[PDB]
Design a protein around this ligand. Structure first.
Ligand SMILES: *C(=O)[C@@H](NC(=O)/C(=N\OC)c1csc(N)n1)[C@@H]1N=C(C(=O)O)C(=C)CS1
Length: 260
């Protein structure tokens, strides 16, 4: 069974695997540890970018608002923001950089604009997600310590919220479409969920990786002849310096989208 395959994958992997797939053809689900908490790592950027998109529904000037980028804003990983030191980026450009390159400075400018991590949590709650919590800025939100509740969610809660955000009721249409455009243009996901799928399927995704070999991906998938699938694959390991394991996410994606 699919469940036996996921169990075996996890057993060989040397970690803890969390999967939630929602098949929007019939609202059926494939769940594996889907009610367990995992550190989101950079997959939490989706919620921060979406919270800014929600604000933009009522402020037609927001996405073009200039944000100053300073040398002191640079952190551990900021390939886009570092190009703009001494200049500005718009909030839209920060959304794009955060989502498509996983730029940590860009995430922090979104969080600061919103008024801190707790405001990102409040936005999740406004969408009916009782599980998501953002506690820290980047990059400390990626410490991913086993059993630490900070900066966590469950696979099922994140799959439900990602479905709502990208295909459902969370955002007004122009904002929904912008979020989907951003996710489809991600550059960091080739070896994760995408690698487990037919090459021709259209995918939007957001990765995350952190300590404890924590390796995550959240995706919306558009088959050629079928309704979309929403898939969350989270993975974490017992040792702090464990290597990240994108291949496990690809393997999980292949298992749960099989035959289909
Ligand atoms: C988000 O997950 C974020 N991760 C980090 O900044 C890391 N550590 O922070 C203490 C980290 C550990 S491992 C690794 N490859 N990055 C950024 N997210 C992505 C992503 O997974 O999308 C990275 C590849 C770079 S940094």
């Amino acid at each position: 069974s699919v469940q036996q395959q996921l169990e075996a994958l996890e057993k060989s992997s040397g970690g803890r695997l969390g999967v939630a797939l929602i098949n929007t053809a019939d609202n059926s689900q494939i769940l594996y540890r889907a009610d367990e908490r995992f550190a989101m790592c950079s997959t939490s950027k989706v919620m921060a970018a979406a919270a800014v998109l929600k604000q933009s529904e009522s402020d037609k000037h927001l996405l073009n608002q200039r944000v100053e980028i300073k040398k002191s804003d640079l952190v551990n990983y900021n390939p886009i923001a570092e190009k703009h030191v001494n200049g500005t980026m718009t909030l839209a450009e920060l959304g794009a950089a955060a989502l498509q390159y996983s730029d940590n400075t860009a995430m922090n400018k979104l969080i600061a604009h919103l008024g801190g991590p707790d405001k990102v949590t409040a936005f999740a709650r406004s969408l009916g997600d009782e599980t998501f919590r953002l506690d820290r800025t980047a990059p400390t939100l990626n410490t991913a310590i086993p059993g630490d509740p900070r900066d966590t969610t469950t696979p099922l809660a994140m799959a439900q919220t990602l479905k709502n955000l990208t295909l459902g009721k969370a955002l007004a249409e122009t904002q929904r479409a912008q979020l989907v455009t951003w996710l489809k243009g991600n550059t960091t996901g080739s070896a994760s969920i995408r690698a487990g799928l037919p090459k021709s399927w259209v995918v939007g995704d957001k990765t995350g990786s952190g300590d404890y070999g924590t390796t995550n991906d959240i995706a919306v998938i558009w088959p050629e002849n079928h309704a979309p699938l929403v898939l969350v694959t989270y993975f974490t390991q017992p040792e702090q310096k464990a290597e990240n394991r994108n291949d496990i996410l690809a393997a999980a994606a292949k298992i749960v989208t099989h035959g289909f």
